[PDB]
From Swiss-Prot:
Chain sites annotated for binding Ca(2+) 2: S170, D187, T189, V192, D194
Protein name: Versatile peroxidase VPL2
Entry keyword set: Calcium, Disulfide bond, Glycoprotein, Heme, Hydrogen peroxide, Iron, Lignin degradation, Manganese, Metal-binding, Organic radical, Oxidoreductase, Peroxidase, Secreted, Signal, Zymogen
Lineage, uppermost ranks: Eukaryota, Fungi, Dikarya, Basidiomycota, Agaricomycotina
EC top class, as a word: oxidoreductase
Marked site positions, Transition state stabilizer: R43
Keyword Signal: yes
Organism: Pleurotus eryngii
GO biological process, one term: hydrogen peroxide catabolic process
Keyword set includes S-adenosyl-L-methionine: no
Cofactor(s) annotated in UniProt: heme b; Ca(2+)
Length: 331
């Protein structure tokens, strides 16, 4: 169907999304950039939807994190999330869709601004949240692999699916893990949806980018990069090691799987059959920029070979001296 402004879309309901598309590209994402706001909004899809336990409750991908923002933004594991919630609230006021829909929508638009990213399938028509999330449902960076895999499993994700979702950390930084160094990314390309994250998390640590005494932080391989202890454990754990390494220099797998599993996540606590497919509204992502590599100065013997089925792929290292990682511009 052709919308009131010439732009087209399979279903006519989806038309209402075009004004919101523009609003958030202009006013949320610094004109369509893969930066802080995009990263936080992606993070927000998870903190919303992960609020889903058959044991403890929660409506999952329901926009509760905004609807019930006084409760949820005050959970420990939600530290820092208040910023992007209070930035999105006004958009939700302004426009005529539920908070649940918006979070997923914004996150989908956001990812699509990242080189090498993908169009996460998006559905329209989530009812309002009817309850806040229980606490203790968001995985923390200092939790054990078992603890985390059980939590994700309680929510409906197999171990391999957790790896796929954690592709998100290829375009991500931390503000609260070490508050002395806000904006410190998880891989050396926070602005590119690539394999660098799965690569760089497998290296032997060298140093600590800020202070060393941080809960939930592992030793980093690179100056200007933070390593979550969780990612460090997951990248080496028997259940996940080989899946983690399978992602290395494997952009099609990162792309297809991330998209597919994100779609599952976005539809937690929701019935796909009572929603409306609006996936063609999401902009077309840019192609991958740069190619897989070990950081400059590094080699294959920096790699901790956790996977037993397969060797680490014979990557080459960037030319030159060990360089450091520039932060995410923001704050
Ligand atoms: C396996 C369990 C996970 C743990 C323990 C975890 C932990 C964390 C931590 C500690 C941060 C840094 C927050 C800060 O201090 O600013 C972070 C950031 C982030 N998380 Fe994860 N995470 C997990 C899974 C996921 C998943 C499944 C997604 C998918 C949407 C995701 C999306 C993000 C993004 C995009 C950021 C960066 C936000 C920014 O750059 O501002 N995370 N995560
Ligand atoms: C240091 O530079 C090396 C190449 O010069 C890379 O192998 C390292 O990953 C690291 O690069 C990081 O910083 C540079 C700027 O000097 C960026 O160009 C990279 O994208 C990365 O952020
Ligand atoms: C606002 O959006 C809701 C949900 O799509 C819709 O039912 C309602 O009619 C809209 N309000 C108007 C008339 O713009
Ligand atoms: C070794 O493990 C790799 C994953 O890194 C697989 O691609 C391969 O099939 C084998 O099991
Ligand atoms: C992204 O944009 C491309 C063209 O630039 C379309 O082919 C696609 O449908 C999506 O909207
Ligand atoms: C490495 O050092 C560069 C400058 O030399 C910083 O910009 C970056 O934050 C990292 O610490
Ligand atoms: Ca929720
Ligand atoms: Ca990256
Ligand atoms: Mn942040």
């Amino acid at each position: 169907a052709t919308c009131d402004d010439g732009r087209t879309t399979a279903n006519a309901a989806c038309c209402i999304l075009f004004p919101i598309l523009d609003d958030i590209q202009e006013n949320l994402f610094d004109g369509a950039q893969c930066g802080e706001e995009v990263h936080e909004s992606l993070r927000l899809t998870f903190h919303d939807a992960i609020g889903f336990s058959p044991t403890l409750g929660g409506g999952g991908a329901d926009g509760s994190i905004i609807a019930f923002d006084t409760i949820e933004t005050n959970f420990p594991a939600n530290a820092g999330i208040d910023e992007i919630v209070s930035a999105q609230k006004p958009f939700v006021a302004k426009h005529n869709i539920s908070a649940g829909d918006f979070i997923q929508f914004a996150g989908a638009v956001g990812v699509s601004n990242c080189p090498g990213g993908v169009r996460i399938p998006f559905f329209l028509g989530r009812p309002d949240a009817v309850a806040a999330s229980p606490d203790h449902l968001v995985p923390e960076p200092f939790d054990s692999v078992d603890s985390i895999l059980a939590r994700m499993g309680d929510a409906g994700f197999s171990p391999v699916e957790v790896v796929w979702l954690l592709a998100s950390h290829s375009i991500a930084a931390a503000d609260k893990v070490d508050p002395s160094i806000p904006g410190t990314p998880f891989d050396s390309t926070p602005g590119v949806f690539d394999s660098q994250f799965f690569i760089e998390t497998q290296l032997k640590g060298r140093l600590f980018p800020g202070t060393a005494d941080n809960k939930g932080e592992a030793q980093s391989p690179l100056q200007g990069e933070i390593r979550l202890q969780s990612d460090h454990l997951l990248a080496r754990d028997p259940q996940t090691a080989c899946e983690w390494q399978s992602m290395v220099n494997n952009q099609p797998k990162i792309q297809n799987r991330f998209a597919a599993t994100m779609s599952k996540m976005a539809l937690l606590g929701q019935d796909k059959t009572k929603l409306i497919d609006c996936s063609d509204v999401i902009p077309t992502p840019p192609a991958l920029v740069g190619a897989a590599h070990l950081p400059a100065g590094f080699s294959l013997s920096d790699v901790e070979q956790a996977c037993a089925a397969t060797p680490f792929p014979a990557l080459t290292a960037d030319p030159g001296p060990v360089t450091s990682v520039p932060p995410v511009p923001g704050s």
